[PDB]
Amino acid sequence: ASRRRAMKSATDNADDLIKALTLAANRERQAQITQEISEIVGGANAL
Amino acid sequence: MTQELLEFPGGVLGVALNLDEHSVGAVILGEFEKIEEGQQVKRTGEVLSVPVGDAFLGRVVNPLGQPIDGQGDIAAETRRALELQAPSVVQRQSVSEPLQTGIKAIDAMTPIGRGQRQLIIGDRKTGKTAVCVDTILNQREAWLTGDPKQQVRCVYVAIGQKGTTIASVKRALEEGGAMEYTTIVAAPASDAAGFKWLAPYTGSAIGQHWMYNGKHVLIVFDDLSKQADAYRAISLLLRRPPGREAFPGDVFYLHSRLLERCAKLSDELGGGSMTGLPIIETKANDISAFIPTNVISITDGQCFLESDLFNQGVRPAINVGVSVSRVGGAAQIKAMKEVAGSLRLDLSQ
Amino acid sequence: IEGAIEDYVSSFEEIGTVIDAGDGIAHVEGLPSVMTQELLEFPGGVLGVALNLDEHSVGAVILGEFEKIEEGQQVKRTGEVLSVPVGDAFLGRVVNPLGQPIDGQGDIAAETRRALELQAPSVVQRQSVSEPLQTGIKAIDAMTPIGRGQRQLIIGDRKTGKTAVCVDTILNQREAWLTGDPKQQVRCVYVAIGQKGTTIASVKRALEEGGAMEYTTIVAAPASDAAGFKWLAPYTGSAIGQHWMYNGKHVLIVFDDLSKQADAYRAISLLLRRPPGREAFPGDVFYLHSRLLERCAKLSDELGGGSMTGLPIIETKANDISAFIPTNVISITDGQCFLESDLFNQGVRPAINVGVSVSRVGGAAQIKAMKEVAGSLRLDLSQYRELEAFAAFASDLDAASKAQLDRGARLVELLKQPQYSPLAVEEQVVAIFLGTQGHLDSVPVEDVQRFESELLEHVKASHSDIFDGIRETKKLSEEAEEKLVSVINEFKKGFQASDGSSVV
Amino acid sequence: SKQADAYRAISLLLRRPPGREAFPGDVFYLHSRLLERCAKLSDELGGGSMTGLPIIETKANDISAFIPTNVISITDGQCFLESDLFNQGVRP
Amino acid sequence: TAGRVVRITGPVVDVEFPRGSVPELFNALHAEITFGALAKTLTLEVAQHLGDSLVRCISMQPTDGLVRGVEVTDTGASISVPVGDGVKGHVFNALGDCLDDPGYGKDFEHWSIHRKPPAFSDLEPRTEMLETGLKVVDLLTPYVRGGKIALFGGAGVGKTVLIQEMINRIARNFGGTSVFAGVGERTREGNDLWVELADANVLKDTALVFGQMDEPPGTRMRVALSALTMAEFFRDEQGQDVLLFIDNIFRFTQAGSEVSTLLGRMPSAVGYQPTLADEMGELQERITSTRGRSITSMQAVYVPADDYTDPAPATTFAHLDATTELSRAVFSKGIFPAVDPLASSSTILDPAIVGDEHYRVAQEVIRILQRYKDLQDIIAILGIDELSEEDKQLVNRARRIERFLSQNMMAAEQFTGQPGSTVPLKETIEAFDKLTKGEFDHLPEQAFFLIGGLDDLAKKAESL
Amino acid sequence: EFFRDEQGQDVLLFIDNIFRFTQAGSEVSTLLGRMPSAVGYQPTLADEMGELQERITSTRGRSITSMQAVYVPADDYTDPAPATTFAHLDATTELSRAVFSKGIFPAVDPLASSSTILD
Amino acid sequence: PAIVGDEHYRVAQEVIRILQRYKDLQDIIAILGIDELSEEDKQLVNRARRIERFLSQNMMAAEQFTGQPGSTVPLKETIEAFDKLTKGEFDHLPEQAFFLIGGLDDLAKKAESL
């Protein structure tokens, strides 16, 4: 019964971790794309 | 000419980098404040050069080779052009003799040999400067022999360092007598992006002049990220379109022609050598970033100093997985090859 | 020769012509005497702002329907720097960002005009924030008090009640406004940037039903109009407000929401082909929001003791309070009230995060009664929240922690309240007294909110001298407190819980 | 993926304006006007048909890059092949 | 003969002069705005020469209401600020106009703001430890008397509480003269500081310069160079030791970005100006303690989006002798002042300058907090109870050391109602030596918050 | 709009799929050579979506209800295309294969679906 | 298998299956520990950790990296050795015996050195 409780707790802590990591990985997708577009367009406007 | 020195009327200089159909695009190598539109420019008739000689031993100099320690003018032996080609594949010889650093975690595990390049890459406040200054200090035991076939001369090239950090390095060398055989090239943080870009090349020219005369030389570049930032600033003011991460397209050719110019010559060229320790400061501890993976690929080995090993008492903080020297046990005395021969692989395991 | 050429060039009722137009920007030839940020007018009744003045043409951003613009139209000077009409006649009106009426209620009897880019009061003209802006939200006036001249950020997710908390704050002021004295008589501005037209209409109805349209003005830049109106809607809001502030009135500004101004200025700047910084915003988005929010201040008596209080709302992309615009505005304002959506869905409403919200003015602006009664509540709720995060998985619990955990649960049930119910400070202090002094310790967690609402109507009908004593003195004296504890005990007997029993 | 990468080369040499991931504006239309020619015809046009099996290559298994996102929206069905299952023995 | 305005684009103004009458770089030009209620005399600074007798200028006031073709007069000198012993007591804007008495300082000696950094021959490195009486700072990041010191962190974590605390630790009792530079902080703090320094009666001994967030980027960058010109006068001419508090020096780089993109120079990484490290260098190197005279400088640095790899934080790290780094994560635990122990640093933390009995304790604390920060990946999933006893012993004192680096500061008294605390260095070293050895391992974690010293730890622990 | 205003009828406007209206706007803004914003969308986006969504509304006792199939790129609700779209809409109906496979027509998931008028 | 013959193809695909299952388990093993796994999974991890090291070799050009001389392993002996490894016939050896070693005669000689 203590294992059940500690394992429910570990599952809910892992679900909050997958959420926080996903909300970080999306912010990094969006920054990577925007940096790539800034770098392309800055070159195209230099010409 | 392309890369001719211009002379502006304040006695300040510049370099002609762009030659357009109707104008010359120049970089000013000094106090730009004194420049006005419509004033005179004289050419110099000289491709970009610096004074050189053994008179530089013990001095602190601007990138143009003039002193800033205040101890009066330098009795320069000749000028040398900053962009002479590296010794070609036929002129070089194998690295075979050690550069003793006196640090166990380097000398046993990832040796440095005369004519190797070894990248001291790491994060802020991890020991990068401390390893290099300790290396320059250890050479005194050889210098006191007075023999040109074993004494090492040193150059320490401070790029973008603050002036009190350079003054701290200077007195930390004087405490160990290393200013008997060290030159400091100082482009402190105040100086315009021309000096901050140029400092590694004038270091390599002062070094090369002793190298081709059969002397052994050690160069420390501290640090090539501030040269790469200064060349980014120069290129963008000149309005060249940037490549990746807003760097100039040819930021690799900035560093390759700096670091390839240090090697061991054949005995047909006096058998001198130059050993390069470039430093790179990696932001957020990632080695897999643009500028560090260039310099990792140009140099012969890494001493990756990691902050989360430094904090846990492993000092000096060499990450033993990533760190390597690709010349390896060819650059060690026989006793050290017998004793330490597998130690990097045993620790990475 | 050259002096005759210069004399001629000086010799040049002036009219220009549009030489280029597109997407909400136009270029004008001529106008050799136009001021930078002069307000232009175009033939369709459309205005523009002369941002860029080149050697041979003027670049104008267009305000309103840029569809009516084409090459070869004439344009003329209005002779005014970028300004809006202003005066008391704006009270009870809905206006577009130019100050033209959009309600269709009639013309505006404007007093004068004011330029938008007039600099904020300097370090020597301001005074210390020292006077309560009562919001009427228990969750805010107990723990994150707002003083007049503060900027308090209402940062939250989408659909958490950010507009509802600000409409509550504007509705609360009616119990002050009925009094004639300009020292008590706060008046308000609500600027809607990028809101749906039905939301601005819903807010207009809610403010009429509560009587707040006596003293509010609404600036409307609904999501259908051009980016230029969305960019101006905050500045014109502050310029309607400042005229009252420098006359010694007290003003409240709600910016709803200041993120959709940043996403308009990103549009205008990228159409002007300026290069972006972080998150594709132009480099000066800090100088967009700070130039806006620094206008909010309390003036010194030498300048006439008025003040302007800012409640900028920010929408956060799934609670990433470390994003660029959130951290730019957290850096400007004097505090924040983070509205955590995880608590909103569990029915905690308003969903105030009591750990992350702060006031950096603090208890300088909170009345001595509230400061005494509520002053412990913040830390008591924060230690309850961690004790609840532990006890969700605790295999055995002690009688001290079990009592503290039950008090915490009844304080969380005490703080919530329904939409459009502002409570006066003389009722807020009694509502927090019930919790903090422990009088709720025998009432079940289902009944607490009905008990607190009913006791406030008991004390409103009979024993009114509790509220009169609190209002007339701003402190809760012992000779009133003994009557309060008596009336609570007399009411505890006559109350009944919806399940369980009667109580002590 | 090499269709798109060849059109991007042509378009950037012609100085046409770059969008996302340096592709020119019309790259959804480049793939769409290609693929939407696959169809089944009615009986009045002889009842013929054409069936398209476009292939694309995905960098490090991502499916949020510009070309994969365009073709996943244009096509009727999507057989994701994955290298992890290829190694584990599940071939194809 | 004089120049004419010919282009205007926000705070950037182009002016055309006669063939031979072109001003030098950094000269101050006047221009008149005469619309109405908005009327004022502008100051422009020369930033570039564009050729054909044309120069590009940066405006120190909002250009709003400036019209093409107005006459501009060249003053033939750079922007100048009043310097002298009579500058102390008063409040100035960037141009050296006094806000407290508008006519004041007109008759004082005027120095140019644009000046070269001190000669390298005149530099010497400082080592003398400054004792602040804060536990985390005195233990792990010992500040240097005559050094350069800084406080990094994202928005809303503690710059202004901690800078007004450091004013109360140092400038309340310091024997020299202080300068304070408000470079683009919020105006309400400028007024709060101007009132507080009069209450504490420190104001007679300090000069304040202000350039708050309402001001256009041309002045919002020149404010730092203005305030620094009053400090380097007190250093060089009077021979006093000086304090130079700067808040917030990220806003100087940001104002440099906002003007650079209107000057039309190409954007660098994340849209900063090129020359960023050269503009930051040309400021920072002037703030140095030349041989025999000292300028203890303390700089707040903003970090946008908590992004500690951003080019503005990343360039300014090179110039600093001690760097306190604040963190969102540590602030979310309720730990005040919210210093990150592992990321923060001081260059004087070595056994030759601080002594072995300090250095051993400071290395033992770091090793413990590091081993905990490595276990955080497991702790987040499985809690404490999975760990081996050699780790679970360590984590149970790591969580106590982490909390015991908190302190109740004198600045926070106006919010918490708790009084402030100072602890001497010897009591700090003796406390963390006992915590790492284990002499407090049996006390509950909740006891350790916001204490101060060991006797207060005992007094608090007895009540729980 | 003609059926709402002139015929005086209630109307139900389906849109399938509102994401491709955002995408096609970004591609026209790129062909017009205008600088692209965050993650590459058109700088007009929050106005250009507004000029369509604000127009779907009731007036004078007659109404245009709308159903809008919305694709989400990478399944993240922070991306400007969904994050602009979900600012406008009042209700979210989600269909589930795990409910359809139980025979429960019309297969609306009762937990994943949501509405903002449920107060 | 039409080109290399089925004996090579079976062994190559079995070695990859094992190393792929191991790379999937590393994230479990780093947190919950090898003691938590199924008996078949724990046996597979002990095979994989040996296979990874037996894919290392003392190259001739690595004389300056390792000091030891270099070695060449025939294709048939390579196949026989990995066939035995995947079927566990070396699971009784210490994990460090396989590292850098070359062929089966060298593997035996290093397992006798330990």
CA torsion sign, C30 to C36 to C40 to C46?
positive
Look up residue E84 and give its two tokens: 């002298």
The neighbouring-strand residues paired with C308 are: C251
CA distance C286 to C270: 16
Contact between B280 and B222 (Cβ < 8 Å)? no
Same domain, E260 and E391: no
Is B touching F (3+ C-beta pairs, cut-off 8 A)? no
Same domain, E367 and E332: no
Q: In whole angstroms, how far apart are CA C58 and each of C17, C275, C341, E59, E437? A: 10, 20, 47, 19, 74
Domain assignments of chain C as residue spans, ordered by start: 1-84, 85-368, 369-494
Phi, psi at residue C193, to the nearest 5°? -110, 120
CA distance E378 to E374: 8
> Where in C196-273 does DSSP place strands (E)?
216-221, 250-256
Helix axis angle, G6-32 relative to G39-54, nearest 10°? 110
Closest CA to C307 of C167, C136, C174, C132: C132
CATH fold of C85-368 reads Rossmann fold (3.40.50)
Say yes or no: D30 contacts chain F, CB-CB below 8 A: no
Q: Name the residue in chain D with its Cα closest to that of A43.
A: D18
Contact between E250 and E302 (Cβ < 8 Å)? yes
Task: Answer whether the bond into residue A16 is a cis peptide, omega within 30°.
Answer: no
Residues in CB range of B144: below 8 A, 6 or more apart: none
Helix axis angle, C197-209 relative to C162-172, nearest 10°? 30
Angle at C365 between CA C363 and CA C366, to 5 degrees: 65
CA distance F50 to F71: 18
Contact between G71 and G58 (Cβ < 8 Å)? yes
Which residues of chain B have a CB within 8 Å of the CB of G96? 349
From the candidates B43, B80, B232, B326, give the one annotated as an active-site residue: B326
Residue that the structure tokens 């090492």 belong to:
B152
- A 10 A CB-CB count for C415 gives 24
Same domain, E272 and E413: no
Residues in CB range of D21: below 8 A, 6 or more apart: A33, A36, A37, D65, D66, F40
Contact between C278 and E271 (Cβ < 8 Å)? yes
| Tally of domains in chain E | 3
Q: Is E179 exposed, middle or buried (0-12, 13-18, 19+ CB in 10 A)?
A: buried
Residue that the structure tokens 């507009």 belong to:
C163
CA distance B112 to B101: 8
Phi, psi at residue F89, to the nearest 5°? -85, 145
From the candidates C158, C274, C278, C360, give the one annotated as an active-site residue: C360
Closest CA to C58 of E11, F33, E6: E6
Look up residue F9 and give its two tokens: 């009828």
Is F touching E (3+ C-beta pairs, cut-off 8 A)? no
Say yes or no: E381 contacts chain G, CB-CB below 8 A: yes
Contact between E105 and E324 (Cβ < 8 Å)? no
Phi, psi at residue E14, to the nearest 5°? -95, 140
Residue that the structure tokens 């569990």 belong to:
C346
Cβ within 8 Å, pair E9-C82: no
Which residues of chain F have a CB within 8 Å of the CB of C271? 34-35, 43
Task: Answer whether the bond into residue A45 is a cis peptide, omega within 30°.
Answer: no
Cβ within 8 Å, pair A44-D64: no
DSSP E195-263: HHHHHTT-GGGEEEEEE-TTS-HHHHHHHHHHHHHHHHHIIIII---EEEEEE-THHHHHHHHHHHHHH
- A 10 A CB-CB count for B212 gives 16
CA distance C303 to B98: 78
Contact between E66 and C50 (Cβ < 8 Å)? no
Contact between E29 and E48 (Cβ < 8 Å)? no
The neighbouring-strand residues paired with F13 are: F66
Which residues of chain A have a CB within 8 Å of the CB of D60? none
Angle at G102 between CA G101 and CA G107, to 5 degrees: 55
Say yes or no: C393 contacts chain A, CB-CB below 8 A: yes
Closest CA to E215 of E316, E115, E95, E70: E95
Contact between E210 and E190 (Cβ < 8 Å)? yes
DSSP E98: B
Strands B182-187 and B60-61: parallel
* Long-range Cβ pairs for the range G80-84 (8 Å, 24+): G80/G104, G81/G54, G81/G107, G82/G11, G82/G15, G82/G51, G82/G54, G83/G7, G83/G11
CA distance E273 to B233: 9
Domain endpoint, select from E78, E103, E122: E78
Say yes or no: E378 contacts chain G, CB-CB below 8 A: yes
**Rg of chain C, C-alpha, whole Å:** 27
Contact between B290 and B245 (Cβ < 8 Å)? yes
Which residues of chain D have a CB within 8 Å of the CB of G20? 84, 87-88
Closest CA to E180 of E150, E210, E208, E148: E208
Domain endpoint, select from E320, E347, E374: E347
Closest CA to C34 of C87, C90, C82, C99: C82
Taking the alpha carbons at both ends of chain B, their separation in whole angstroms is: 56
Which stretch of DSSP H or E encloses residue E413?
helix E413-416
F17 Rama sector, left if φ>0, alpha if ψ -120 to 50, beta otherwise: beta
Q: Name the residue in chain G with its Cα closest to that of B342.
A: G66
Contact between C121 and C353 (Cβ < 8 Å)? no
G86 vs chain B: nearest CA distance in angstroms? 22
- Domain range enclosing E73: 1-78
Q: Is G113 exposed, middle or buried (0-12, 13-18, 19+ CB in 10 A)?
A: exposed
DSSP G69: P
For chain G, how many residues are written?
A: 114
Phi, psi at residue C132, to the nearest 5°? -75, 125
> Where in C13-116 does DSSP place strands (E)?
15-22, 25-29, 38-41, 47-53, 57-63, 74-81, 83-86, 94-95, 112-115
The resolution in Å comes to: 3.5
In the chain, the amino acid numbered C337 is: C
Contact between D1 and D57 (Cβ < 8 Å)? yes
Instruction: Please say whether the structural domain C1-84 has been given the CATH code 2.40.30.20.
Output: yes
Q: Is E238 exposed, middle or buried (0-12, 13-18, 19+ CB in 10 A)?
A: middle
Say yes or no: A40 contacts chain F, CB-CB below 8 A: no
CA distance E262 to C274: 8
Residues in CB range of C22: below 8 A, 6 or more apart: none
CA distance C143 to C362: 9
Is B59 an annotated catalytic residue?
no
Which residues of chain G have a CB within 8 Å of the CB of D87? 16-17, 20
Contact between C373 and C431 (Cβ < 8 Å)? no
**Which subunits count as partners of chain B given 3+ CB pairs below 8 Å?**
A, E, G
Cβ within 8 Å, pair E68-C32: yes
Say yes or no: G65 contacts chain B, CB-CB below 8 A: yes
H helices present in C337-447, as ranges: 341-345, 368-374, 377-391, 399-415, 425-436
Say yes or no: C394 contacts chain A, CB-CB below 8 A: no
DSSP E142-179: -EETTSEEEEEE-TTSSHHHHHHHHIIIIITT-SSEEE
Closest CA to B85 of B327, B296, B291, B256: B256
For chain C, how many residues are written?
A: 504
Residues in CB range of B179: below 8 A, 6 or more apart: B58, B170, B173
Contact between D22 and D12 (Cβ < 8 Å)? yes
DSSP C319: S
F37 vs chain A: nearest CA distance in angstroms? 8
CA distance C32 to C57: 9
A45 vs chain F: nearest CA distance in angstroms? 10
Look up residue C430 and give its two tokens: 């009694």
Measured in whole angstroms, the distance separating CA B35 from the mean position of its chain's CA atoms is 31
Provide, for chain C, the percentages of residues in helix, strand and coil under a 3-state DSSP scheme, each rounded to the nearest 5: 40, 20, 40
CA distance E144 to G23: 50
HEC profile for E313-374?
A: HHHHHHHCCEEEEECHHHHHCCCCCCECCCCCEECCCCHHHHCHHHHHHHHHHHHHHHHHHH
Phi, psi at residue E135, to the nearest 5°? -60, -60
Say yes or no: B239 contacts chain E, CB-CB below 8 A: yes
Measured in whole angstroms, the distance separating CA C394 from the mean position of its chain's CA atoms is 42
Cβ within 8 Å, pair B329-G100: no
Look up residue C384 and give its two tokens: 């309850």
Contact between G86 and G79 (Cβ < 8 Å)? no
DSSP C396: S
E75 vs chain B: nearest CA distance in angstroms? 16
Closest CA to E203 of E61, E36, E90: E90
B178 Rama sector, left if φ>0, alpha if ψ -120 to 50, beta otherwise: alpha
Q: Name the residue in chain E with its Cα closest to that of G29.
A: E378
Look up residue G18 and give its two tokens: 């094992």
CA distance B167 to B170: 5
Contact between E245 and E231 (Cβ < 8 Å)? no
The neighbouring-strand residues paired with B159 are: B187
Say yes or no: A35 contacts chain F, CB-CB below 8 A: no
HSE of E99, CA atoms in CB hemisphere, 13 A:
19
Residue of C331, C337, C382 to mutate, interface with E, max E Cβ within 10 Å: C331
CA distance E420 to E412: 7
Residue that the structure tokens 């000749």 belong to:
B78
CA distance B109 to B329: 9
In the chain, the amino acid numbered E140 is: L
CA distance G47 to G20: 12
Q: In whole angstroms, how far apart are CA G62 and each of B296, B324, B327, B339, G68? A: 20, 13, 10, 17, 8
Which residues of chain A have a CB within 8 Å of the CB of E377? none
CA distance C311 to C289: 13
The neighbouring-strand residues paired with E369 are: none
Is G touching C (3+ C-beta pairs, cut-off 8 A)? no
CA torsion sign, A45 to B3 to B4 to B7?
positive
DSSP B51: E
Look up residue B145 and give its two tokens: 């022999």
Cβ within 8 Å, pair A22-F76: yes
DSSP F65: E
Same domain, E170 and E304: yes
F56 Rama sector, left if φ>0, alpha if ψ -120 to 50, beta otherwise: beta
The CATH code of the domain at C369-494 is: 1.20.150.20
Helix axis angle, C285-293 relative to C259-271, nearest 10°? 130
Binding-site residues on chain F for chain A (CB distance < 8 A): 35-36, 38-40, 74, 76, 78-79
Say yes or no: D64 contacts chain A, CB-CB below 8 A: yes
Which stretch of DSSP H or E encloses residue G106?
helix G104-113
* Long-range Cβ pairs for the range E377-383 (8 Å, 24+): E377/G31, E378/G31, E380/A13, E380/A17, E381/A10, E381/A13, E381/A14, E381/A17, E381/G31, E382/A10, E382/G31, E383/A6, E383/A9, E383/A10
* Closest by Cβ to B167, choosing from E26, E124, E373: E124
E378 vs chain G: nearest CA distance in angstroms? 6
Same domain, E283 and E391: no
Say yes or no: C278 contacts chain E, CB-CB below 8 A: yes
For chain A, how many residues are written?
A: 47
Query: Looking at the annotation, which residues of E are catalytic?
Result: 159, 185-186
Which residues of chain E have a CB within 8 Å of the CB of G31? 377-378, 381-382
Residue that the structure tokens 């925007």 belong to:
A34
DSSP B184: E
In the chain, the amino acid numbered B128 is: K
Same domain, E240 and E358: no
Domain endpoint, select from E33, E57, E78: E78
DSSP B148: T
CA distance D38 to E241: 83
The neighbouring-strand residues paired with C81 are: C38
**Which subunits count as partners of chain G given 3+ CB pairs below 8 Å?**
B, D, E
Same domain, E191 and E238: yes
Say whether B46 sits in a helix, a strand or coil: strand
Phi, psi at residue B91, to the nearest 5°? -80, -25
Say yes or no: C180 contacts chain A, CB-CB below 8 A: no
Provide the experimental method for this PDB entry. Answer: cryo-EM
CA torsion sign, B262 to B263 to B266 to B272?
positive
- A 10 A CB-CB count for C318 gives 17
Same domain, E73 and E176: no
Closest CA to C153 of C353, C7, C4: C353
CA distance E289 to E124: 7
CA distance B33 to E115: 10
Strands B273-278 and B24-29: unpaired
Partner A, chain D 21-50, Cβ-Cβ below 8 Å: 21-22
* Closest by Cβ to C327, choosing from E93, E192, E305: E305
Say whether C184 sits in a helix, a strand or coil: coil
Say yes or no: A44 contacts chain E, CB-CB below 8 A: no
Closest CA to E210 of E228, E236, E183: E183
Residues in CB range of B85: below 8 A, 6 or more apart: none
Closest CA to E85 of E102, E101, E106, E109: E109
Q: Name the residue in chain A with its Cα closest to that of F79.
A: A30
Phi, psi at residue B45, to the nearest 5°? 80, 10
In the chain, the amino acid numbered E203 is: L
